[PDB]
Design an enzyme around this catalytic site. Structure first.
Site: not given
Ligand SMILES: [Zn+2]
Ligand SMILES: [Zn+2]
Ligand SMILES: [Zn+2]
Ligand SMILES: [Zn+2]
Ligand SMILES: [Zn+2]
Ligand SMILES: [Zn+2]
Lengths: 518, 514, 510, 48
Positions: B285, B290, B297, B305, B307, B310, B370, B372, B374
């Protein structure tokens, strides 16, 4: 200078009313010793009863009218008391057989009226003027007021009387007429006369501030706001300079520029300068936070009590600075040079916005890790403060709707002042006292500094542990002033009058007294 | 390599990356304990335990080739200090040559077999002895049993914890030598350079994860992977929007619509020079920020903060590319993948409810913008499978629920094939990056039955998100052994406030042992 | 043993149905070999199709009535095998008698899961719930394990049985056409027994907290015990005090109901080769206490179920006492009490003292379950058993990890965990192994007490709770089955009775 | 100990001590290996 639009119906300027009806009021002060002529409009007595809690109304002034003197005999007044803010209206025919409106507002039983007390008095007085058609108001002081309080009374009357109707269209008030004359009767009148046009300038500066704050974010954005600043300077003969994005880039104002990244409006940094003819003894920078709308950014203001619908007011700091510029440019004080900067921008959610976690570099080289995008004010101020300091100034005072925490600490009445210099803070508390804009001194607790230690950047924007966020935000700002006396007035709590649903214009008078009284 | 778009000229246009770290300059020398210890310059630390006796006395058992030092370290002196795990003491004495030496120990507790988490503790104690001390040399004497893997883990952890990431420091001295004394030194020697590469693999992943989202965005992340590939001689393809549309990657493209950075799909390939016997796809990923999208979020504990992290999956994958490209395993072809994009809120963003078509023609109803990761992984898996590999292994910061299931110390591995799962667990043991096998519960599949699309992106009833995300991902692998490693919980070290670079050693051990 | 009352209209006992209609069903099994008769009631064929959608239904079994015309392939093609899709038809047979005939779809896969078989049975129960029938017969045209057959039967009985005890007809005959119907016959009485253990557990769980409270629950278990001749003991407050069960006593401090600690023991007929203790969480209602379940999601309305662990133990006792496994001594234990808000309640912050002498800092009063389990676990351990297995609706976190289908088992002993996983297989109650991660143990270091009840940092709550419990077993293999997530059936609005069969299978196999 | 002006500066011990071993330890060359960053500590066992 061109304001971008999304659709052609988007406003391309803030509508500004300069010649307000308040300006058309002829104000005459007379000495109380020679008695009151009661011949037209409304005559209000400001009356107290020192000691007797809600004691009776007893008029002390000679009144030069048999009939009106009759009406005001003690016997006839006893049914009324002086409870702060109480008022009555009387109707009678004077000696000239003319109909004449007379009244009083109670000023309570404490002979020393406070800011908030005088405000209640003026409020009662303004309710007597609304919903009435009057050409002349006369006010008779039968209370003791020093010169500052007399001025504050006038400023407040003017401000509270003025109604902001720029955004009314189908619902303008058919019934707003304004008095054309205002008479004031006071002891040692000659000594209070100076205060009238000062009050009038103070009122406009604050009303002007008020019009910018109250202008919604689709009218007041960073371009319209800076265009207004330029116009103001031009009307006042101030040197001005609006730094656009290319200059802000050259100046490496990366903290400021990050906040505005998400906006359809280019950042615009206002710099206006007032310089005395003659010896410049003090050089002051006045820095105003100018976020024209604060969504919070990706840390969006979504939580209950975040008052997103109010966030047009996030430029209140800027407005106070600009209303100061109005007063300073008008009163032309001697031996000062004042810069009135303002790192103006808008905090939006966009593909282009800065994001929590971003590390941005301020104009002094300091890297800042962004922990919350809704702590944008301090980012813009950081760069504004570097810029101020590079001006070689003696005092930097910023004013900013920085932290909602201010509502939990001081609430809605008193602003908070922080700073790195006791003398400067005391000058602010000194101007607080003479402007009647209440400020309270709050500490920059250095113990919380460690919580702004970032693992990756030189500093964190926010504390992830300390909840005293007005203090933390002050700590952060302190990092951007190396070697200049600097104070920070946090007006997040006091800028908006929730009860009256309008701005207070808070700061203009404070900043002006500060500049003037040096 | 593409130009990084900018809003302002101050916007960074690359991730700064440090390849030559101070750790690379450390000369490492391994000596057999049987020859005794020379205790001279620097700091010499004994790793001591006392099995059975909780907080038992320190006894130094190695011969020390210095009468003054031996005198200082005799049992009668040492018995007043104890072996409590992570405890440490510094000593100062004059050796036989009238030279001041610094000696010490780190207690290793009273259990014979230290666990990965114990050893971390020891290493952490050791690193505090290196911090705030301008030393040219550290020498470490093992008086505890460790196997080869744990020894290597010791060095990687040391190297990694010792190293300080200062790329983002503006306004705000490492040892040059490391001696290690241990029994059967000759068998451990070979772990040294392995540990050095693993350290950098991890550290490199960590630099990428720690890189903030204005630095590390899809263009600059993919540019970094290109650069890494160029330094390592890996093959690389970066697929851009035009090629991605052609491949019909509507899941992956949808997530990136709202970003100012065009999607970039990273395809690194290592091929072995001899007959290729296994082909592997590693999929990470790679969401460089994100925001959650329209499902922003905003709720407490959502950690917006953090993210930037991700893209931890992608980082682990790239760091594994580093380790693989450096160690050059044989008979294997590895593809390193990562549909990189940024999940933003924009007029251009995809919406909750949008129905989108993956490159395998499956239509997906978006329940929550969110979830996202997957979706980007869906198209990566389709792409991965069209490569025709024997194994597809993904690694992703997929589900916050991992913090509620395994926490921050053990990642979850799901899959459709037991042999491959066991190989991942095996790689967990030997890399000492802990993973636990979690089920793909087929009973939850019906809650992914969309009234309109072929499939729902999220379950509206089943709160077991990691399992449901897994189940969703499984719909995009037809015929290949596949496993999925959810590192949402473990990627970021909350106490130390840095990334772990988790997965790099794991994935590398996987590729090497199989 | 008398239940205290606030008003005279407060129930003073849990109504239990022991003799259910399901006990009144005569079951026979027949080899599909010999073909099928259609003399009466409802005949269902369980059918699948490898390579489906599903594809058409095709019957393969020969039928001893020219019903055969209905089930010929022209008419059956109109119907598909999509899992749980069914149809049934009324018609006259060779006697002009009324027969009902149909099918349940079993998907494409010829090996069937726990959950698919459930979907199969639910569809079949639907049909039985809306048809008056003297008889149902079932024809298996799909392969099934001996265990899965039983599961089918168990699930059929349980799903078919309806609980009417708080509201102010059934088939009398089940016939089954299988194949090697000799291999299977023996699963019949086990099924029926497992059904009741399950159903019984469900009667306790479903019993609201005002009927089923520590005293009523303890009376019921004593009565159950009595019926099976299990040894029984109910420790009341005074003996719980003597025993210094302070964590446990603390949780019930707030209730109007005295703590009751259930100890049932099944002594074995055989040679005593394993002493085993099953410990259930028996909170008859969990308000959360002073950390009240007030947050959206906290499900206060369901907290009568927080004794599901206890019921599962008790239902297991039913099965054990009945089926009479050999060579095992078994102890059925539960610290029964209520978690209530009161002037008398324990508070956040209280430092309480377990019976082993461990001081515990309560950081959250809704984590009451591990507190009572701590005291029971020391009590269990003092018994000198080989295995302790506890089963608890312990943590909301389960729902975020494994969800509503599988329970997690944590433990300190691998081979015990393994005996639980294998019981999972043959009970067809899904359980998954979860780790006790020792790195998290530090987060339980109280500053003032010996141990914290909860971690304030770690969110892996199921794992911290296991680690907490693990501090209360010194020397004995121990496993903790956390059923918070699987115990109530949210779609169907009823207890699953989860765990009875698994525990029984566990004592039956190991 | 502190180091006024020098942020994270070297440790320098000024006191004269009544022991020749510790005196040795406290020499500038050894102590500059350490810094005065608030709260940073080191301590070593030795024989007097
Ligand atoms: Zn803000
Ligand atoms: Zn703001
Ligand atoms: Zn997401
Ligand atoms: Zn994500
Ligand atoms: Zn609870
Ligand atoms: Zn509970």
């Amino acid at each position: 200078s061109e304001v971008p639009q999304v659709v052609s119906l988007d406003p391309t300027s803030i509508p500004i009313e300069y010649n307000t009806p308040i300006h058309d009021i002829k104000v005459q002060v007379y000495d109380i010793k020679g008695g009151c002529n009661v011949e037209e409009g409304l005559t209000i007595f400001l009356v107290n009863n020192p000691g007797k809690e809600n004691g009776p109304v007893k008029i002390s002034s000679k009144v030069n009218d048999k009939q009106v003197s009759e009406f005001l005999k003690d016997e006839n007044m006893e049914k009324f008391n002086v409870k702060l803010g109480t008022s009555k209206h009387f109707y009678m025919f004077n000696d000239n057989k003319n109909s004449v409106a007379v009244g009083y507002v109670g000023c309570g039983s404490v002979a020393d009226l406070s800011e908030a007390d005088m405000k209640r008095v003026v409020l009662s007085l303004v309710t007597m003027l609304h919903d009435n058609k009057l050409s002349k108001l006369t006010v008779v002081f039968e209370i003791n007021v020093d010169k500052n309080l007399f001025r504050f009374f006038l400023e407040t009357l003017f401000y509270e009387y003025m109604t902001d109707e720029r955004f009314k269209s189908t619902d303008k008030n058919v019934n707003m007429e304004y008095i054309k004359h205002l008479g004031v009767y006071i002891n040692n009148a000659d000594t209070y006369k100076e205060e009238v046009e000062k009050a009038r300038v103070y009122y406009f500066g604050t009303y002007y501030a008020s019009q910018l704050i109250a202008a919604p974010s689709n009218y007041c954005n960073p371009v319209s706001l800076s265009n207004a600043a330029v116009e103001l300077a031009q009307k006042l003969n101030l040197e001005y300079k609006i730094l656009g994005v290319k200059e802000l880039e050259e100046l490496k104002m990366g903290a400021y520029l990050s906040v505005g990244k998400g906006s359809m409006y280019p950042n615009k940094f206002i710099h206006l300068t007032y310089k005395s003819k003659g010896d410049v003894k003090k050089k002051i920078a006045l820095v105003g936070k100018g976020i024209t709308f604060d969504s919070g950014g990706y840390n969006l203001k979504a939580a209950p009590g975040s008052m997103i619908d109010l966030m047009k007011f996030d430029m209140s700091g800027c407005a106070a600075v600009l209303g100061c510029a109005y007063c300073v440019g008008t009163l032309k004080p001697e031996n000062v040079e004042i810069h009135f900067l303002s790192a103006v921008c808008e905090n939006m959610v966009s593909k282009n916005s800065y994001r929590p976690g971003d590390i941005i570099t301020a104009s002094n080289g300091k890297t800042i890790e962004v922990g919350n995008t809704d702590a944008e004010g301090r980012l813009t101020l950081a760069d504004a403060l570097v810029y101020a300091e590079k001006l070689g100034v003696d005092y930097i005072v910023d004013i900013a709707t920085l932290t909602g925490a201010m509502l939990y600490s001081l609430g809605t009445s008193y602003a908070g002042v922080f700073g790195n210099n006791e003398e400067l803070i005391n000058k602010i508390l000194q101007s607080s006292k003479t402007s009647n804009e209440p400020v309270w001194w709050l500490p920059i607790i250095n113990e919380y500094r460690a919580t702004l230690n970032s693992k990756y950047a030189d500093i964190n924007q926010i504390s992830s542990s300390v909840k005293a966020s007005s203090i933390v935000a002050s700590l952060f700002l302190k990092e951007f002033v190396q070697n200049t006396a600097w104070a920070h007035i946090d007006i997040a709590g006091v800028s908006w009058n929730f009860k009256a649903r309008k701005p207070k214009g808070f700061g203009v008078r404070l900043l002006t007294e500060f500049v003037l009284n040096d």
